[PDB]
Design an enzyme around this catalytic site. Sequence first.
Site, mmCIF file in Angstrom:
data_model
loop_
_atom_site.group_PDB
_atom_site.id
_atom_site.type_symbol
_atom_site.label_atom_id
_atom_site.label_comp_id
_atom_site.label_asym_id
_atom_site.label_seq_id
_atom_site.Cartn_x
_atom_site.Cartn_y
_atom_site.Cartn_z
ATOM 1 N N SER A 144 38.991 1.678 -22.052
ATOM 2 C CA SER A 144 38.118 0.570 -22.405
ATOM 3 C C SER A 144 38.861 -0.357 -23.351
ATOM 4 O O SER A 144 39.817 0.056 -24.002
ATOM 5 C CB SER A 144 36.834 1.078 -23.067
ATOM 6 O OG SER A 144 36.057 0.010 -23.574
ATOM 7 N N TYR A 157 31.861 5.750 -29.244
ATOM 8 C CA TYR A 157 32.517 5.307 -28.018
ATOM 9 C C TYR A 157 33.962 4.904 -28.282
ATOM 10 O O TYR A 157 34.882 5.344 -27.587
ATOM 11 C CB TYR A 157 31.746 4.135 -27.413
ATOM 12 C CG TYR A 157 32.243 3.689 -26.058
ATOM 13 C CD1 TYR A 157 32.082 4.494 -24.939
ATOM 14 C CD2 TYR A 157 32.856 2.453 -25.895
ATOM 15 C CE1 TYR A 157 32.528 4.087 -23.696
ATOM 16 C CE2 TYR A 157 33.304 2.037 -24.655
ATOM 17 C CZ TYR A 157 33.137 2.856 -23.560
ATOM 18 O OH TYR A 157 33.581 2.445 -22.324
#
Lengths: 270, 270
Positions: A144, A157
Amino acid sequence: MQDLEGKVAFVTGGGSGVALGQAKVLAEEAQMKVVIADIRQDHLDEAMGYFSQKNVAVHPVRLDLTDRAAYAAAVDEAEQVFGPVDLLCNTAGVSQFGPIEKATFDDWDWQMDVNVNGVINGVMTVMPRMIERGQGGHILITASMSAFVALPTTGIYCTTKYAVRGLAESLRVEMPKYNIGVSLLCPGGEAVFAGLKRVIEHGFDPVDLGRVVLDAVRNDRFWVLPYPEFAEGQKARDQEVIDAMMSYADHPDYARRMKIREQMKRDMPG
Amino acid sequence: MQDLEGKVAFVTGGGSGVALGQAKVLAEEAQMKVVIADIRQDHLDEAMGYFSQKNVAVHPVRLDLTDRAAYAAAVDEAEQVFGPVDLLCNTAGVSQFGPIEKATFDDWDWQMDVNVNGVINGVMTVMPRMIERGQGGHILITASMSAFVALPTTGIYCTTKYAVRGLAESLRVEMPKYNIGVSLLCPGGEAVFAGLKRVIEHGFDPVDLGRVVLDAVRNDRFWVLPYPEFAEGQKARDQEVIDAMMSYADHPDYARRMKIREQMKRDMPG
């Protein structure tokens, strides 16, 4: 990795999202034999509803990738149905955002297990088999932009995506001697960064991103961050660290270490 | 964070190594009340052998930082003996190097639990207490240059240090509104990088590095990487990512996203 036709791909989370996009492109365009591994049966059924209408070789397997024993079994199944895994796509992932001070240990453990252990489990299950086989291979890790950019409410995250970024960069060092390629894809998920990412979100397409991955695999590219917009922002983030390092250029111990290096380039061979 | 005299520090791994160096400087120079938490009793005894010969306020507690219940109890103990933790030093860490293809799941789990969960456990135990108290505070995370540089045989270690780097950068975003400072220290542990790090290893001193930390805490600095040598090497690593991003500056979808942004700077307020 070249000559993908007929070679075997193993795609985690392949029943939906980015991973399904990867599975579609590998199975249709690249004409690979694709195993899609997903924890949810209905997502598997949906994907197979699609693939049953295409001329492809796709095999579903229901898998909780946090289950190491089951993962090994799923890869065994892949070998029996198609053959040894040539391309591993670690693309499965979860996310739950919120203020870090409100996060529970269960919140941490869940996202850590899927996003980090899930990738570790796949790598440790497949990569030793690749090496043993001695025919090379390729490992994709989908992280990501959160592996570069911390944001409000993305604490857990971000931590998991930094982790697998480190794993990816580690694989990058040790895998080439086994003719195993490594790619790190960062799709995403400064208020300027948010605004730039939102426009990317609006135009995002799993199949298009799947073709980016395909291109990276074929040309053996490690850094797959197809977003020029983030350049100036990342340069600024990079410069913080450089400036931090250089802020001690004055300090005597540094000049002392430089004095030693200067002397050691003399005296010795090379 | 200012006015450290009398304030309370909690230092994991404080019985030896880098952490002991931090404990020494905080307890002697800064005159903080320091709790040293270590899993090994003999290391605790050794440190207290030293501190018993100094005019300091130091309290030992034997703690396995992977034990969440015990961690909470250790911090409770800190509050009863001294008071609320003002400075948390997450400095404990382990490392075992080897070829990644030879790593066991036990190897992964052990280093992950100590290096990542150990830091998560401390942050989640202490930081909510800091916020509740409303007197601010400071959180130090000791990672490694391995949070920037992957190396042969350091795959697991690298993964754990990238992880806590992400956590640190995440804290950096959300903690300032609570007047809680955040510092990320990277001591360490291109064959050029190895050669440069080895000279650093030769001159390394835990007390000297402890004074670097002290300086960072006082001035509320996040990036604590006191090594100008690594600058040119890091610039090169940074440029890989920038070049990767910019390699798609040609691609039509990017020009399309730029067309949209251009139009949106017109039309709207700001």
